[PDB]
């Protein structure tokens, strides 16, 4: 009994066929999306029909996922990484 989004994400991240567009960080708990554009084109449509990146992130935020902001303003803006507030 887990929310449809939670399952969609779990399924999406663990499916090896999406490895090039979305995957777990090396032995970690953060979700790496190497290129926003490619992810939206190749992966998103398989799990969400009426969706865009902004709505997806909004869903992620709801489940405690936040965008890692480690880039000193000085792959560029297409790289996204999410880490959850609930961690060890």
Residue 36 near residue 53 (C-beta atoms within 8 A): yes
DSSP E strands in 1-88: the ranges are: 23-24, 30-33, 65-67, 80-84
Rounded CA separation 20/33 (Å): 8
CB 39 within 8 A of CB 52: no
- Residues of the domain holding 88: 1-88
Cα gap 27→47, rounded to integer Å: 25
**CATH number of the structural domain spanning residue 52:** 1.10.10.10
Does residue 55 contact residue 15 with C-beta atoms inside 8 Å? no
What's the number of domains the chain is made of? 1
The contacts of residue 21 (CB under 8 Å, 6+ apart) are 33, 34, 35, 38, 39, 42, 43
CB of 8 within 8 A of CB of 62? no
């Amino acid at each position: 009994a887990r929310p449809a989004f939670v399952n969609k994400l779990w399924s999406m991240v663990n499916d090896k066929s999406n490895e090039k567009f979305i995957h777990w960080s090396t032995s970690g708990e953060s979700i790496v999306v190497p290129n926003r554009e490619r992810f939206v084109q190749e992966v998103l449509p398989k799990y969400f029909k009426h969706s865009n990146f902004a709505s997806f992130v909004r869903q992620l935020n709801m489940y405690g996922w936040h965008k890692v902001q480690d880039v000193k303003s000085g792959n560029n803006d297409s790289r996204w990484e999410f880490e959850n507030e609930r961690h060890a």
